[PDB]
Design a protein around this ligand. Sequence first.
Ligand SMILES: [Ca+2]
Ligand SMILES: [Ca+2]
Length: 887
Amino acid sequence: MGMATYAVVDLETTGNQLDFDDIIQIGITFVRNNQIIDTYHSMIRTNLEIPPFIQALTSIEENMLQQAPYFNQVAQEIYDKIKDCIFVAHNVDFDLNFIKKAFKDCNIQYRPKKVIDTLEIFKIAFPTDKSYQLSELAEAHGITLANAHRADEDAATTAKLMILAFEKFEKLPLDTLKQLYYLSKQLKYDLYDIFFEMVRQYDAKPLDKFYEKFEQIIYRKQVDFKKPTTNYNGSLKSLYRKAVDQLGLTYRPQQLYLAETILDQLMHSEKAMIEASLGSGKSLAYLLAALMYNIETGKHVMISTNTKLLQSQLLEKDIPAMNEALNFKINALLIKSKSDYISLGLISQILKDDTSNYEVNILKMQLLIWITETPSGDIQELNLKGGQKMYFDQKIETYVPARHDVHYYNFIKRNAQNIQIGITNHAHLIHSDVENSIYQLFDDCIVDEAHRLPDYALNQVTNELSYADIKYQLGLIGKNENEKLLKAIDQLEKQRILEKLDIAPIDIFGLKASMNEIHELNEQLFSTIFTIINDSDVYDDDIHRFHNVFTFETKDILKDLHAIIDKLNKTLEIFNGISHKTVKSLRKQLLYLKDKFKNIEQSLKAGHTSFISIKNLSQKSTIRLYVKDYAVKDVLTKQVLEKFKSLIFISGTLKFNHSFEAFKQLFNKDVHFNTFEVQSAKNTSVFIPSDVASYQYKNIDEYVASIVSYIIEYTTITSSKCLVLFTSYKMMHMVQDMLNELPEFEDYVVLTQQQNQNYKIVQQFNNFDKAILLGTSTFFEGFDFQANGIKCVMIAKLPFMNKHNAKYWLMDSEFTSTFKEYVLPDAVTRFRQGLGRLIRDRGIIVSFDDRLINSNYKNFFEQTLENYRQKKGDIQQFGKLLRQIQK
DNA sequence: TTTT
DNA sequence: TTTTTTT
Ligand SMILES: [Ca+2]
Ligand SMILES: [Ca+2]
């Protein structure tokens, strides 16, 4: 047969309604033998009003169209070009249907022989990609998009990206044969005949790169590390000097001093705390301090970071830089927890043919291909979202490992005699021994940005009951004889009555009813929970808010748990002679559900500090009930302090009232803790406006008005970039709209706080030299800032946490004076992290909150300004000063 | 999510 | 013995 031809089709349209919209541009790229042979592109004219939204999107305007044909002209042309091809397009559903109707209105019956959806092929072939949006996908794969949203290019990109995947689908038939039989259950589009054609026209050859077929799974043999080559007999200084010289960096005394500090504390197995608040130097500091510790003693150093950008700059920027200083080739490994690695027990998921969620079938195909690639086996690097992550998190939670399972976690175990630098995240470090065993693998660790460590303790200390999780679990049992487990039990009982299996009698009808009675006892619970949620503080905010409610009795909820737990055990007792796999897995499922409820009931029967949560007031389908099963002070000490010989704490903000006591208090027994600490100060200037009235939310409008007035004053005196740290949503949007209205900020682009691609806002902010400013919320720490000229930071108010903050809710039981011991030291450290970032060039700071001057605790706040120059007065003294700095 |  | 909504 003539090799099939592929029509990769793209349509720009006026809308999404199949019956109410027209094609306004069709681009086609044709493909055969993994190669482009022809392309088709013709703007299509529509007598409809193209709404402005499609114009900013498609770059297409109405005046362009009046010279393009209507669709019925080219209609016979297009059909005659695509009639005998295979139809291909991203979200083919949307594409094919539109061109199917447009052909119908020209008396043309398009019934294509074979349909292909690249969204499926891309999900399988590129399973580690963060998004499958055709634009960003093309960017992650060295594909140049000359222009975005054009169909003649969206059709080429979608065709090129196809040709990669088709060439990537060229490995081993034992694996390709897996995907043929898995492709069938795709139950979406005709793709099997593609693999069926690569099986026929296949060329057999072994490959040693990929390892043996563990069971049936084929994978890539992780490559271990070897003995490190570190020949250096100098001192830490001579290394530093050479290093700073070789990299073309500037010598810094305190940095290298810091470096000698860290080595000294390790060699002696000590426990320091180092508030540095330095610049980029800290990154190289650790590296050389840890690199030295190994050359001298041969021990290993874990580096637990807070974020990824910190972990990366030191992993892939400052490591190949350091490895030019010599033939160093040091070893750094991103050591995560044990659960976050693959056990190659996915053969069990593979054996789960009953899986019909489709999304999982893709995961089955994703895992099969990801596993011949990943050098680490880190699950998260396979970005997992929605249902997929929920099933895979569910299977991994109850996985009963086998005697000889090839687990990717054990690569860390058998190879940390050779990683001089191991790097982690604080959230992994504090997991339980069974969850995370790094204390048994690394004896020496340096926690970075350690003031956020108790905040990470707060999420590993609470357990949760999720309406969503319970709903999914019930879903995996079924409520009728046509649903997963219940459907299988049917075949079992059927096979007792028909195939005569040695199974005992099973009341499938009773179980089905029994299972429906469970479904109602659950809803009944989330109603008693829900109504006291609807009967509480209602916050009306465009951003969906987490209305965490804290006041409630726990008797009626405890009576609905005792009801639902007792019936689960009764449904289990129908099955005691459980020798069959299906009825075994069914019991394991029903049993795990019983433990989720039993654990919360066991936490609420006792009286553990407990609270409810919800995500939407209208959607009762997102209720979550939380309980405090452990104590943070306990979690920190045992999982970290007690289980580490040399533990060096270092952060930009670790000192309160000049006393680390406000940090060591959580470490009970307060075992001896060595203390430590280490131009910009005077290059900076603070201004406390006096005209500003006090913070009164009752009347938040004249406060934001005084803020825009200063933003007005600054922006007109000197157009350097600005930064207004905000702690409130209402207030941040109030000034962001008040900025966009006044014409003084014409030629000025304001940026709000958006979680999606938040980093992008920073990119655009630097993209301009003097036309940018931005309000934000609790984002002080991460941000760095650079420009030409003056530098301003405006803090709206002292960053206190309300008594309605769950962080406070979970911590109140754990402190005597929850204000003096916790929320005040947190407010200060957060406050002094906006400041720390500003100082660098010269700059100023503006603190609008007058609590800093006329409050009893003002002392602790003005302590963070001892090295600056404070001043107070009108917006007039602010103007003169703003001119004074330029002088 | 992922296509206008 | 002092305080208001993100990450
Ligand atoms: Ca399309
Ligand atoms: Ca397009």
